[PDB]
Amino acid sequence: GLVPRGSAMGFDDKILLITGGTGSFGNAVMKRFLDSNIKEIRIFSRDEKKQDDIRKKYNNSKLKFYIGDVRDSQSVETAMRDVDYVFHAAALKQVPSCEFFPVEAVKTNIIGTENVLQSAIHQNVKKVICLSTDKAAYPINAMGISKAMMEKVFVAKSRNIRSEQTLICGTRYGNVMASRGSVIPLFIDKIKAGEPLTITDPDMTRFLMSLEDAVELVVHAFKHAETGDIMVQKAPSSTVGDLATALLELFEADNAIEIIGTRHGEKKAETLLTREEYAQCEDMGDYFRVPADSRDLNYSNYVETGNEKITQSYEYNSDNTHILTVEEIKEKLLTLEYVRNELNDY
Amino acid sequence: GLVPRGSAMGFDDKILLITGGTGSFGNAVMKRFLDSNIKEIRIFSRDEKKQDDIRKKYNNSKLKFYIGDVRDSQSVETAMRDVDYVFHAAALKQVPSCEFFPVEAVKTNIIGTENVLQSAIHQNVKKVICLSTDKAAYPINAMGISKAMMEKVFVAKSRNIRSEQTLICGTRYGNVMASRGSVIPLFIDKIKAGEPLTITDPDMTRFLMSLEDAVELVVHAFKHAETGDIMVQKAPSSTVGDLATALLELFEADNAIEIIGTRHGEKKAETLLTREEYAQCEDMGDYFRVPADSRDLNYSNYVETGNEKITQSYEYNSDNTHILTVEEIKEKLLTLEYVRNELNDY
Amino acid sequence: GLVPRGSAMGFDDKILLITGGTGSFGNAVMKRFLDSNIKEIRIFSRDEKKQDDIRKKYNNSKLKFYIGDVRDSQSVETAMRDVDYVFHAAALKQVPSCEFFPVEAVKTNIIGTENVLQSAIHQNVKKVICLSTDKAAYPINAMGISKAMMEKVFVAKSRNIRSEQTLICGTRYGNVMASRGSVIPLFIDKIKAGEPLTITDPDMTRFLMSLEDAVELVVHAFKHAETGDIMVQKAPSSTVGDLATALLELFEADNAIEIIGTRHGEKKAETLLTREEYAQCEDMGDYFRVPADSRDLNYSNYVETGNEKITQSYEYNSDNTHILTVEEIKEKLLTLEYVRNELNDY
Amino acid sequence: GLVPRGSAMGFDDKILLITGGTGSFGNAVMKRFLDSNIKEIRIFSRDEKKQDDIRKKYNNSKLKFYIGDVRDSQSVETAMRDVDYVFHAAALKQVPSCEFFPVEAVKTNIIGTENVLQSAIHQNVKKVICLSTDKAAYPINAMGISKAMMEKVFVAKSRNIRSEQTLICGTRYGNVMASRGSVIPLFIDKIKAGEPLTITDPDMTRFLMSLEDAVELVVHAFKHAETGDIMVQKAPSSTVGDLATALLELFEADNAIEIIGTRHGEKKAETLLTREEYAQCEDMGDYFRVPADSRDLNYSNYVETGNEKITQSYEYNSDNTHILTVEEIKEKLLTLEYVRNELNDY
């Protein structure tokens, strides 16, 4: 459910706003809360086409479609009036497009987040959850750097805003299995096309999680985050060399593998918690919570006092979590209805 | 000199603008070009006090003092008219202040750099060199993240602007020995005060370079960078445990060492070139040049083609350069007139 | 071709920018010029997903993908540098979404067009063609009103800018057969679903044209418009009552028709030239050209001098063009490969 | 009075703000409420001269004069603090000047109205009445188009703002007899000058109303409008051919008539309610009220549900109201003290 064990709220008078509400998570998150008592789900984005498609498929009078842009504080303010909860998912999230147009990544991902927070605070929103990415930890490309900076901005706002006024937190997650354009659909299309599998670096690792796991992480933050927290779902990882084998064996196929090399903008492994975040985090079980440090603007934490737990820690990354076996990758692959349909169809 | 072997220019009709011109580098860079043929050095910053101090100390009619703010495109445009060269050194550069006010770090370091580039291009400036920091490689604090994003922005502008119109490049350097507030003056003050040396993590490493080495790196970029390049000076490093010993032996002092632990916002070692940058860089000798990739907006470099040299490389960092011995640290320490004066005086 | 009879240009050194370049026309217009000598086609829009899809389908090194927003003059300026020709197709074009968020329609369709024109003029673009709609003539809904105002803005700019500097014109067209969401796909889906055809007002008329006819109109303006002109393609029309019959007979189907009534925001017939435009227009044959009036800011044309040709004229609309017979509608329907495939498949 | 039969309010603690407060309506509306209990009437405009003239003529300590511009939200906010009621009359309202400078018409009439509404809402104003024009229905010139778009903007704001917070409505009226520069003073001046009457199109019709009728319409909206309503006063009309005869017979004059032809930017007849507005309106008697449709952002009203009452209706225009006889035009002309004085004086 959407509510901790031993609570209830009833969302029967509550309004959820989803920025970037037409994209993959916005939709999965939308479709989760449609399974609820919620009075209204406002879908806020720039794109009238994607909005009309969703409207017509769901025909649900809970859904309201707002045209607007996180870059524009007036357009956010219109959609934010009377809102209780915000899932902030609006972003430029593709690596190459942020790398070539990084000022657009700063306008949407960094300034656009500050506008959403400022409007949410003015409108007395109860909670804002900002979506981020493992590419924001030790980042190397403009998309991850802009997301890392977005995290600093929402953490900084949480220090100066009381929790009871507006609680502000965020989620960072790994690689969503079978994202549009991502490596699983790519490889399947190569299997079916009779093409070789283009492997970048077979020993490269990525955290592996489903879209459903990604929605649970947001719900987990919605229920349990404190203001300033970054919530991360613990996740296993796969090497690309093993993921490709898993798919080949499942599809009973003997397409060759071709090594194309590491592409620009990519790391060998992804980090979900930096050394410092790990040192400071609380283990919630299937999640880590990274609380905001120095909530009173405690300069001396950066200057004159240290923490030996930081020196003693190391980062949480896709090399040091459980790296799945080919068998495990297969089982996890088979929980996806995308893989099943393609499989049956093959 | 300011000109490659086998060239001359004469700067006798040339105008240099230094944003952040009143800070430590701006001044050292200013005082280098005062040693030149340059027609005019404009010092651009926000602070009328620091400007008046410099004016009165130098009394040099080459120096012109402009009040203005990189955040404001009109104020930059006033100072940029008729300029040939820009050293862009304006920045919020202190870790804690960027971490608590990251929107100010985005306004000055990222948006302020885009305003300087746009104005330089409109005014037909020949070259703009942007100063950056090893904290921008795999960054973990808001100051390094904003500087990493500044680098993406100037690299992106260089792809879309012809070199012959305006050449745009930047420099990244390590820890400047005996910066205001930095660990060498701190430890000396503890030596002289009879206080214990507060060591954060004795095995922490930082690249070690002088302010003079930092000015040479900027001059090196001024002379040799191509548009889009990031230039880094190769540098040795010290552990903090060894730097403290070097100072203690020099000062013939037996203050105790106290371990305070790693402070927030700090890494164990600093990186000057990421894995990818190292793979792509050219070794100029005492420098590496990191050329801009995908200058034609080549998406396919991020998506469908890879580079096996990236897979084969690793990052250039303060653990894997030459880590100096206590003896070496001492010799390097003694090249500083700050250390000498304090030493004699002790 | 893209060039008048008795001319040649060679577009071999030329750059075309398409704002809204990922939408239906942008693409058809893009795919037309791919059939040409053109050096570069820049696709400018806000959406990185749609851009990546197009890139990957075409794999054509002429295509460059710019992320940006017509609302933001800096982001337009980046994409406009070195451009020769602009097809301005960026717009919020859905009736309900403009009616509920008309300030967003004013920001994109009116202010966004002024930013494109101002940037094109600063960058010495040769020609800008602005796309408009018959809903802008005697308009009744916020989408048509914003498009009518966009036309006034580009006409006003053409009076004050010399043609040899930048030529600025626009196109207005009717209902594109088999647009996403439009009545032909709707009715086909009802045919195939066994559902009744929902007819709004069977005697309602709309101009009928194909997407290919729409691209020709833009090319016609590209080749022949003078600055300030509005170009309209003459077109026949259908009643909805007749279009529905045409589809039923083609699909050899006897789904019932249900009258739902006129929807909000709709006219009984659409106008392509107002009384005044018709009075002033030149007949180019399959097109009318509406030249800009009062090019010297001739107030007296609105105040003290009149034109008896205006009094004598009437508007050009979907009731007074050739209204096609069911047979004609069928023949025109069959020129569409969308209709053919659906037909065969049925 | 200013209050419905069976109510009272006492305006003894109330503050009225009139934007465009120095123009013809602002003044007539001002002079109406001076005839009241109102605590304060603030006159808001840009022009210090017109403000000083009014101040000095009335010498009334209820009148306060604010300099400011509807284009500037801070300047509106200063004048809006503690306001109860707003009559928004600020506008660029001349046809040629909007047609040549339509971006100025969009800044004042559309964006300026959104700033007034946003400030009124922030300041807890009770009611805002926006003045519009029959030129906004099926509009053909930039002035009417900007006013049509202003109406969409205030209607859209009324859907998202509760009535009890701020009620937002508007008025549309026809041709005010003996406006500065309008056809009645023009013709009188020709009568007195011995010049021929320049008639544009003698069969052209315009709604005829006095300034006093125009103030009553605003008061009617003030008392009875609901949020989102457009209120129109029913009105008879005159042909220009008949108005000219009426004036000639009254002035016992035989100046010839010259036909100059229809001028740019003019329709043959003006519309006060479009087909759709008429279908949806309630007849209040001497007024129609057009309520806002789809107050819950009901997309389906534009897309999947229709209204047969719309199909069955037609527009309310100056051809289909009561067209007055020459005798009627004369009687109505004689109710004007402007006509009387000119008449006696002749």
Ligand SMILES: NC(=O)c1ccc[n+]([C@@H]2O[C@H](COP(=O)([O-])OP(=O)(O)OC[C@H]3O[C@@H](n4cnc5c(N)ncnc54)[C@H](OP(=O)(O)O)[C@@H]3O)[C@@H](O)[C@H]2O)c1
């Ligand atoms: N691969 C992944 O799925 C993944 C992994 C880690 C983190 N994340 C993060 O989770 C969030 C959503 O992920 P997703 O996969 O759902 O992304 P997605 O499908 O691309 O959705 C994000 C949505 O952002 C909207 N948007 C973009 N710019 C906007 C603006 N300026 N104003 C308002 N809306 C805007 C877009 O919709 P319109 O075109 O309709 O405006 C888009 O559909 C993003 O913040 C992303 O960083 C995603």
Ligand SMILES: NC(=O)c1ccc[n+]([C@@H]2O[C@H](COP(=O)([O-])OP(=O)(O)OC[C@H]3O[C@@H](n4cnc5c(N)ncnc54)[C@H](OP(=O)(O)O)[C@@H]3O)[C@@H](O)[C@H]2O)c1
């Ligand atoms: N420790 C180091 O020295 C070190 C190491 C690596 C990289 N760097 C980089 O090198 C550059 C300069 O280093 P530095 O040590 O000379 O720094 P610094 O002494 O702090 O000087 C930077 C100058 O920036 C100016 N400034 C700040 N905001 C500005 C704005 N909004 N508009 C115009 N001027 C502004 C300030 O002068 P006013 O107060 O007069 O405006 C300040 O003196 C910075 O970009 C820094 O990131 C420094």
Ligand SMILES: NC(=O)c1ccc[n+]([C@@H]2O[C@H](COP(=O)([O-])OP(=O)(O)OC[C@H]3O[C@@H](n4cnc5c(N)ncnc54)[C@H](OP(=O)(O)O)[C@@H]3O)[C@@H](O)[C@H]2O)c1
């Ligand atoms: N039914 C018709 O086809 C029809 C009829 C008459 C006239 N027209 C006109 O012709 C033009 C294009 O028609 P179309 O059918 O190709 O429309 P469309 O497919 O919706 O394409 C327009 C494109 O506008 C882009 N866009 C929207 N806001 C933008 C912004 N703020 N900055 C940059 N790009 C933006 C969108 O792409 P992103 O989401 O990638 O930004 C969208 O794909 C429009 O002006 C429309 O008014 C169309």
Ligand SMILES: NC(=O)c1ccc[n+]([C@@H]2O[C@H](COP(=O)([O-])OP(=O)(O)OC[C@H]3O[C@@H](n4cnc5c(N)ncnc54)[C@H](OP(=O)(O)O)[C@@H]3O)[C@@H](O)[C@H]2O)c1
């Ligand atoms: N013929 C008619 O009378 C007629 C018919 C139908 C509708 N209307 C509408 O009714 C309203 C007023 O009619 P009216 O005849 O009283 O017009 P008017 O006498 O021209 O008065 C409008 C006032 O607008 C003020 N104004 C213009 N731009 C402004 C800005 N940017 N900020 C603040 N004030 C501004 C001007 O005063 P300053 O120069 O002192 O700023 C002007 O006196 C207008 O909205 C008009 O559209 C008029």
Ligand SMILES: CC(=O)N[C@H]1[C@@H](OP(=O)(O)OP(=O)(O)OC[C@H]2O[C@@H](n3ccc(=O)[nH]c3=O)[C@H](O)[C@@H]2O)O[C@H](C)C(=O)[C@@H]1O
């Ligand atoms: C370039 C780009 O668009 N990256 C988007 C993407 O980020 P990630 O790179 O993490 O995901 P992927 O599914 O593409 O790589 C999976 C693994 O397979 C490897 N990979 C990938 C493609 C391939 O052909 N071969 C291969 O081995 C690859 O090196 C990696 O080890 O996905 C999300 C949606 C984004 O935000 C980014 O814009």
Ligand SMILES: CC(=O)N[C@H]1[C@@H](OP(=O)(O)OP(=O)(O)OC[C@H]2O[C@@H](n3ccc(=O)[nH]c3=O)[C@H](O)[C@@H]2O)O[C@H](C)C(=O)[C@@H]1O
């Ligand atoms: C999960 C559980 O209940 N185990 C408890 C049990 O620990 P385990 O036996 O699991 O071994 P570890 O914790 O040493 O490393 C495991 C993984 O975590 C990550 N981990 C660990 C340390 C670190 O600094 N950074 C980090 O990412 C890294 O991915 C690494 O590979 O004891 C320690 C002291 C605890 O507090 C745990 O909650």
Ligand SMILES: CC(=O)N[C@H]1[C@@H](OP(=O)(O)OP(=O)(O)OC[C@H]2O[C@@H](n3ccc(=O)[nH]c3=O)[C@H](O)[C@@H]2O)O[C@H](C)C(=O)[C@@H]1O
């Ligand atoms: C917090 C802060 O203001 N950091 C500024 C600073 O960045 P860095 O941290 O790199 O420099 P430092 O000279 O302070 O540390 C040197 C080494 O000594 C260690 N160090 C430092 C102080 C101490 O008491 N003990 C100690 O061991 C320390 O852990 C490290 O290993 O200097 C420049 C000017 C900035 O931009 C930053 O704002």
Ligand SMILES: CC(=O)N[C@H]1[C@@H](OP(=O)(O)OP(=O)(O)OC[C@H]2O[C@@H](n3ccc(=O)[nH]c3=O)[C@H](O)[C@@H]2O)O[C@H](C)C(=O)[C@@H]1O
């Ligand atoms: C400096 C010179 O002239 N040496 C040449 C001679 O090399 P050396 O014997 O010096 O050993 P290496 O290059 O293996 O590593 C040295 C350091 O560089 C850094 N280095 C090296 C590789 C890398 O991927 N990343 C990196 O940072 C890292 O700090 C590491 O510790 O041969 C290789 C192949 C060259 O091309 C050199 O120019």
Ligand SMILES: CC(=O)N[C@H]1[C@@H](OP(=O)(O)OP(=O)(O)OC[C@H]2O[C@@H](n3ccc(=O)[nH]c3=O)[C@H](O)[C@@H]2O)O[C@H](C)C(=O)[C@@H]1O
């Ligand atoms: C509401 C809406 O989104 N209108 C978009 C649309 O504008 P138009 O209305 O002109 O097109 P359509 O294909 O929908 O109507 C065709 C005719 O069939 C009639 N029509 C339509 C649907 C139906 O179920 N029944 C019916 O008779 C209808 O009354 C009309 O007589 O198409 C383009 C793409 C847009 O810009 C607008 O946002």
Ligand SMILES: CC(=O)N[C@H]1[C@@H](OP(=O)(O)OP(=O)(O)OC[C@H]2O[C@@H](n3ccc(=O)[nH]c3=O)[C@H](O)[C@@H]2O)O[C@H](C)C(=O)[C@@H]1O
């Ligand atoms: C097309 C051609 O070559 N015909 C020439 C031949 O004309 P036709 O016999 O075709 O009859 P018409 O022009 O009277 O009306 C036809 C349609 O046009 C539209 N039309 C016409 C007049 C008008 O004011 N508005 C208008 O929209 C309206 O859709 C109407 O139903 O003589 C006149 C005087 C010309 O100048 C023409 O070029």
Ligand SMILES: CC(=O)N[C@H]1[C@@H](OP(=O)(O)OP(=O)(O)OC[C@H]2O[C@@H](n3ccc(=O)[nH]c3=O)[C@H](O)[C@@H]2O)O[C@H](C)C(=O)[C@@H]1O
């Ligand atoms: C051009 C211009 O400034 N039009 C302003 C104006 O809008 P309207 O045109 O409605 O008013 P008018 O009194 O001028 O026309 C009355 C009738 O007499 C006819 N008319 C007018 C002048 C003439 O010489 N002869 C003539 O027959 C004329 O064709 C029409 O049939 O008045 C208000 C104040 C505005 O907002 C507009 O800016």
Ligand SMILES: CC(=O)N[C@H]1[C@@H](OP(=O)(O)OP(=O)(O)OC[C@H]2O[C@@H](n3ccc(=O)[nH]c3=O)[C@H](O)[C@@H]2O)O[C@H](C)C(=O)[C@@H]1O
């Ligand atoms: C005013 C009154 O009390 N008459 C009532 C009495 O009506 P009347 O005998 O007056 O004839 P009508 O209503 O047919 O047309 C009159 C004028 O209105 C305008 N009118 C009318 C219909 C329309 O769709 N649009 C429109 O503008 C147009 O200007 C047209 O010329 O019966 C109908 C059904 C009513 O509901 C009325 O309230």
Ligand code: NA
């Ligand atoms: Na707080």
Ligand code: NA
């Ligand atoms: Na370049």
Ligand code: NA
């Ligand atoms: Na011109």
Ligand code: NA
């Ligand atoms: Na409301």
